[PDB]
């Protein structure tokens, strides 16, 4: 269930740190942020590969393009792009 | 840069943003690999190459008109990279 | 395979996701959670975790 | 604003004399790319490929 997955996601952010209070604070924050937000990926990937090349990371850019083409040959890819850097 | 390059692809191909994705990635790659000009950045050397091209084509009247337009472009002071624009126009002639 | 490729992309993009957190995110997307909203949640959870670690 | 239009009109006349096949709006994109420091050699190669 979504409620379990957000619970597990909040616990992963508590690795390396009362515990129940912190878990409830992080859960509340996650839901409050999700609700505030509720109220093409290929082009973003091309822009990211270009940004890697201008930083001198051309091998990482070529590898990113290859891995994305392998996956094509969408919501998860859009999440990874929105979390880039 | 990137949005302008996507718009350039859409316009030349007569296609929407979704249909130009391959040509846009090609364009980004070519621009990213060629960050520095291999030629000297001299506006005068381009203006001389443009005038020589009109002479080569037997279009001496158009070479005189180009010299007037180049003087007007210089006096306006609006553009910073005048050399690069003239070089692009010469490269596409 | 597909999860390993997604983890390699995650590393190349420096997203800071590990295999466990990525596996939770994939299952949230499969349940119709918007990626842009989920990215915002992850960014806030990181910031709040680090603030709380600095306070303990 | 006036000086920018008058500058684009002069560039369009030079573009026509050179037979470059650029319209005003494509030329406006090219000028903005060059003013943003895009290499004109690389840009000319891209435009030639996109026309083919």
Determine, for residues D39 and B35 on separate chains, whether the beta-carbon distance falls below 8 Å: yes
Q: Decide: B and A in contact? Rule: 3+ Cβ pairs under 8 Å.
A: yes
Contacts 24+ apart (CB under 8 A), B63-71: B65/D17, B66/D14, B66/D17, B69/D10, B69/D13, B69/D14, B69/D17, B70/D14
Nearest CA in chain A to B29: A50
Does the CB of D46 have a partner CB in chain B at under 8 Å?
Answer: yes
Q: If 0-12 CB within 10 Å is exposed, 13-18 middle and 19+ buried, where does residue A79 land? A: buried
Q: Counting one residue from B and one from D, how many pairs have CB atoms under 8 Å apart?
A: 123
Cβ count within 10 A of residue D19: 12
Nearest to C35 among A10, A71, A75 (CB): A75
Which positions ≥6 away from A31 have C-beta within 8 Å? A6
The Cα of D20 is separated from the nearest Cα of chain B by a number of Å equal to 4
Nearest to C29 among A12, A64, A79 (CB): A79
**What is the residue-wise DSSP string for B34-62?**
--S-SS---HHHHHHHHHHHHHHTT-HHH
Nearest CA in chain C to A17: C53
Closest CA to D52 of D21, D15, D11: D21
3-state secondary structure of A15: coil
Residue with tokens 């859409």: B10
Q: If 0-12 CB within 10 Å is exposed, 13-18 middle and 19+ buried, where does residue C51 land? A: exposed
Rounded to whole angstroms, how far apart are CA atoms B19 and B9? 10
Q: Counting one residue from A and one from C, how many pairs have CB atoms under 8 Å apart?
A: 117
Partners of D11 on chain B (C-beta within 8 Å) are: 73, 85, 89
Determine, for residues A50 and B28 on separate chains, whether the beta-carbon distance falls below 8 Å: yes
Nearest to A60 among C5, C12, C48 (CB): C12
Cα A70 to Cα A74, B31, C2, D39, distances in angstroms: 13, 25, 9, 32
Which positions ≥6 away from B2 have C-beta within 8 Å? A47, A50, B28
Contact map slice: B 35-74 vs A, CB within 8 A: 35
Partners of D10 on chain B (C-beta within 8 Å) are: 69, 72-73, 76
Nearest CA in chain A to C19: A12
């Amino acid at each position: 269930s979504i409620t379990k997955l957000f619970g597990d996601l909040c616990e992963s952010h508590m690795v390396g740190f009362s515990k129940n209070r912190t878990k409830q604070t992080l859960k509340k924050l996650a839901y409050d942020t999700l609700f505030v937000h509720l109220f093409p990926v290929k082009n973003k990937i091309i822009m990211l590969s270009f940004n890697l090349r201008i930083c001198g990371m051309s091998s990482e850019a070529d590898r990113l393009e290859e891995l994305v083409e392998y996956l094509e040959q969408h919501a998860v890819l859009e999440l990874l792009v929105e979390l880039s850097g | 840069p990137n949005v302008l390059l996507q718009n350039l692809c859409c316009r030349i191909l007569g296609k929407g943003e979704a249909d130009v994705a391959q040509q846009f990635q090609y364009a980004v790659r070519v621009i990213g690999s060629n960050f520095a000009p291999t030629v000297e950045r001299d506006e005068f050397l381009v203006t001389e190459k443009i005038k020589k091209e009109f002479v080569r084509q037997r279009r001496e009247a158009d070479g005189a008109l180009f010299s007037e337009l180049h003087r007007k472009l210089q006096s306006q002071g609006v553009l910073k990279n005048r050399w690069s624009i003239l070089y692009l126009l010469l490269s596409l002639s | 395979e597909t999860m390993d490729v997604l983890l390699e992309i995650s590393r190349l993009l420096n997203t800071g996701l590990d295999m466990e957190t990525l596996s939770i995110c994939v299952r949230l997307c499969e349940q119709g959670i918007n990626p842009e909203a989920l990215s915002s949640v992850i960014k806030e959870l990181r910031r709040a975790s680090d603030t709380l670690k600095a306070s303990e």
